[PDB]
Amino acid sequence: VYSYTEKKRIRKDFGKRPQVLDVPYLLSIQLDSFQKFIEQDPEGQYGLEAAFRSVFPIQSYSGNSELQYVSYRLGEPVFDVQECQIRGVTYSAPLRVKLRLVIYEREAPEGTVKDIKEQEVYMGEIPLMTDNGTFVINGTERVIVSQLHRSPGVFFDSDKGKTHSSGKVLYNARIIPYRGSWLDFEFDPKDNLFVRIDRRRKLPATIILRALNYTTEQILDLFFEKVIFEIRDNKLQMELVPERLRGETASFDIEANGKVYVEKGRRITARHIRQLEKDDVKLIEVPVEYIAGKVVAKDYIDESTGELICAANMELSLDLLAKLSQSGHKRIETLFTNDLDHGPYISETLRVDPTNDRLSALVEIYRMMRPGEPPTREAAESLFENLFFSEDRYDLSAVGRMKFNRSLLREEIEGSGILSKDDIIDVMKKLIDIRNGKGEVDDIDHLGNRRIRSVGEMAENQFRVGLVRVERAVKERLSLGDLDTLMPQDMINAKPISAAVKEFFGSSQLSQFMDQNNPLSEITHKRRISALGPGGLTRERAGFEVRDVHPTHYGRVCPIETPEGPNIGLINSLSVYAQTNEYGFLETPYRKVTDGVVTDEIHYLSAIEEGNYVIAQANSNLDEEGHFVEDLVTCRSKGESSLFSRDQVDYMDVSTQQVVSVGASLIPFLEHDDANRALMGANMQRQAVPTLRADKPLVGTGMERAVAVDSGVTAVAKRGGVVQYVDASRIVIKVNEDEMYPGEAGIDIYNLTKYTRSNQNTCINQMPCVSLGEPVERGDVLADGPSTDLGELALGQNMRVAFMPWNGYNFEDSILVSERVVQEDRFTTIHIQELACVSRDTKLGPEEITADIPNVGEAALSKLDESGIVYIGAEVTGGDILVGKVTPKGETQLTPEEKLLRAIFGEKASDVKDSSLRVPNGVSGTVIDVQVFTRDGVEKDKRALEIEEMQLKQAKKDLSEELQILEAGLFSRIRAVLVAGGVEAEKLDKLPRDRWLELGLTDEEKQNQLEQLAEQYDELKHEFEKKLEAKRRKITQGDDLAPGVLKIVKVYLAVKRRIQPGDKMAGRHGNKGVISKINPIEDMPYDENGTPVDIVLNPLGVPSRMNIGQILETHLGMAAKGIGDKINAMLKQQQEVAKLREFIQRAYDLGADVRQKVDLSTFSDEEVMRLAENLRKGMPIATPVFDGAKEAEIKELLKLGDLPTSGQIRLYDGRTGEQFERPVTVGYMYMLKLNHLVDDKMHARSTGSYSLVTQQPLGGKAQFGGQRFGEMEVWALEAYGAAYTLQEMLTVKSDDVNGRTKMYKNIVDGNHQMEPGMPESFNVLLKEIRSLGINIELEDE
């Protein structure tokens, strides 16, 4: 039982495991983050509002003024997404802020206040966002990628053997802010405890204990328990608490309480404490091996004589022990020297430190930022304390204070975004204690310790700094004015926070052009996870911390949805089901136990909790009147794995695709592929492009309907009802009183895109999927887009595939395609691209634009406006004009024996340079839009003023339909309220509305329900009373183009980039390669059906690719498409309606190992038949990745294709009628054509552009350049001994103007020879060397 639009389309899952949750709308790290950056939140600590709440009220340091605040705002837009391409200006609107001022009694003592003033002011701009989760910035969808960074606070790592005079093994503690300056704590090479304040040069770690204000025995009371000795009746003894054995380098042997405890060699590292606490020990007796090397902590004396024995900070010795044996005063306080037990590094570095007090421990820090400059007393304190407590220079958020307290095992759920001058003691304790195993490293790449920084967080981090670095003239001049008579505004500049926040989405370190190759690519782009920028590193200044994998990726971040090459792992994607808590820690869905079984009481849990509860793996299985057929439940934790009994479990995974991101989640057999080709599969589906006759993945996962809606590329019934109009750009519906809101007309609208540019110059368009009078439910599909088939995804097309080598072309994932593909105009792609021109501010003001280029290429001119511009709808190719930027030439010399021809005898008209904008040599396809723009006081040019009436026609018509569509709902509600008792109301739905006022209904309140609706009507339609002009003067709008430009012009091209060789293709399972010949339908193998095969791809390569999902998609596609081919034949003869039902139902009904069923007996014998059209493409299939339709199910379903259930068939050759020495792999694969496009990249050159800087060629397609014969390319000619071919590149084909201008013409000499003159790039260098100051010249031989 399936919906009303599903009567056209239903997908067949095969999966096996107990999901009770499905796809969430994939875009949240854009969407919810954009909201919380720009939300009026009353008590939160994030976004624009929290940035202002961290700086304002600015109660001035001058004590005479205050710039107060109330809240942000956004409002007052003018551009919209259409103008944000057609014009191009970033889709943005002004940030404005509520500000105030207050002043007090200057003169009296009984009123306390005297003045109060408050307003709004401007404070910047903000880009704007679509329902589709996109943004539009300089003509293009430039979009922020989210970051995955070390969580702010502190970290604790271990440089366990780096380098230098002892390969130095280390442990550390290191500050990492959300915003700010720095501090590290570690050890020097010699092994003193050391520090790097702001990570500058070496300082002894006692300095900061003086700065934070602790004297020597306070440092002991903060970091050291204190060892105790005695001497009793006949022996030496020590005195204890039952944890004081934690590090001892035990050369020695001990008993305590009543058994042996320590023995010769067994170093008592803190692991050992679990020998002692259980045993209540408070006294021990030891060899002298633990009664020296223990530094006495006070002075001691001898009443046997009247004398001393030793002083504080002194050792013990056999003679001192002999005097202690006499003493009377038989006690000693002593220090821990055992390493990590307490770290003696403090005690000893307290005597390897020149600093003495807090002033020295701040003055020496001033030197560490200002060598050779006087340490200005008060600024020596500020320079250090403002590293951690400044208005501009430190923050953590509540998130980073939480991580700080968490990595220190605190209980304070209370604290500050700043540090404190005593929090630092615990950072130092952890370093003193860690360094051989009281603990270990802070679990860095745990995905609840590394943290997400979403789009709105990445914008927030700028406002946490810009408000405390740039406001200078405001912060200055606020001190000076008598603000009883001046205002909370009077010095605020407005230029910078426009561009600096508009283009934070268009030129920022994470805000690239979105991957608009096709819908799947933009859907995953919106949830990309960068490891880069402030919080990570780059591609270059980075190791494997930015590229590899750590097991907490499970359920959260798929390790294969990354670019390839050196870019590996630097940017990733969020798995389908994954999200984050209020700390940006990553989380996942789970099933959960009640009374004895893993119930359907589903939950979500953090990466940290995956390290704290027993999660069963997706393997496990339920039972009859019992519990589990899974006797030995396989389980998992932190990303690791185990085996347990039933009596031991808390949770389980909900699905397998919870471990998988969008591109990877469409690979139906990852059960059978290596990661190196799964990586390719996660990118080839993204490089794929819109095609003229698109067709669906027949094999599939289920994501083939989610990814059709996860960016709105298909329109969907957000309310639903009955379809009421349908048009190639427009759709409307009507609704009923079960939903219809308290005064509406009962309507929705679902209009559709048409032709514009994109970020990889792909085409954009949409088309309907419903018709007049169809009822549709709240989730039915209403339209299609650039990569769909009538209600599901189509990133490509299906083709028949032979997995065999052919006559040479297909060696290395390279692809043969049939002539039949060109006949059907298939894998032809469609593109929309833009080209432009200018007229500069001259001394008058304008510049010329026309078509005059006489006797230079006349046919490439025939296609133009009066203004020198092509027409919308005209075809253009290879060299046609687009915008008439002609330029006259000159030659001028013209003396009585130099007037050789023109200026007397012929062509006595212009010599205009071929400088007008033209179609590039290789481009072909229709002009689709044309524009002209100017400084606004000039109302717009004739070619834009005709296009005003081209755009006005659409709205002038549509609003004349809309007004009728609107009142045909609204007055139909009034008509219905009348029909409820005044049943004769069809005498009224045939009148002017004013004449309904001669009426009445019944002696009951329906009468007054009619009255109040008739009163309300004249207010309601004021909605319509604007509409047409609200598009018009966005076209006739002007914009300034900066001083230097009066006007700008554009043309757009629909480039029909056809199927051709050298272009690139792929399939879902990581097969990727060039189209390497087009083959006649018989120049190809044919099946046991007596029928040829559309594509051929080499299997000899496959064992080096280590992947087999490509074979399984091909074989399951042979069943899936074979169902549709058999339907095309069966629909003709029909045989019996129960025979149409036999095959069409059996295609769905055939299964044996499955959670789902398209049970077509739960659908009627015409729902069976409306579905048959979209089944002629083939049967659509589903399979959660790792839950899938394995080989045995393919070998069952193939009894619908009815071809050999081996998947390996007696192929023939169309040219010869032969049949090969063995059966061969065949089927039908889902395949793709990819935006590498050789079509765009035909770049050769005879001669062209030259770099004035060096007389050498320029380089670039965007420069028509010459290309680099590199140093390695020289090594080949050197190695060959090929000196003339090498010298050719070095002068007569490059910078030597003399050489290249003679060699070009040396064909006219007939003697095609070299005639070089001087390598100008060496002539350049001979004067650059002299411009540095080095003299250089020549000799002769």
Binding site: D548, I568, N619, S641, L670, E671, H672, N676, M1106, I1108
Partner: protein
């Protein structure tokens, strides 16, 4: 880290790979493909600097009078024949009147 794991893949590509067998072997694949994409620089930069030192050996002359030479051998690591006389000697030239009794 480069070292082996107690967690095998007892299956093969026709038997299949579960989520864990995929996920664990994907760590080794990421490491190997990241070294593939980086450790080339530790050979290409060295190759660039090598040619500056290597260039001048153009075959210019004929015998150079150097009546001395290296006592080369087959690659015999004491206890293998990893390269016979042929491959190492391949169109080099003698520097002594070499003679060995044995069979001819």
């Amino acid at each position: 880290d480069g070292s082996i794991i107690e967690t095998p893949i007892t299956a093969n590509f026709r038997e299949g790979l579960n989520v864990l067998q995929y996920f664990i072997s994907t760590h080794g694949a990421r490491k190997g493909l990241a070294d593939t994409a980086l450790k080339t620089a530790n050979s290409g930069y060295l190759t660039r600097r090598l040619v500056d030192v290597a260039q001048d050996l153009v075959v210019t002359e004929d015998d150079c009078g150097t009546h001395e030479g290296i006592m080369m051998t087959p690659v015999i690591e004491g206890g293998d024949v990893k390269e016979p006389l042929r491959d190492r000697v391949l169109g080099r030239v003698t520097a002594e009147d070499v003679l060995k009794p044995g069979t001819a």
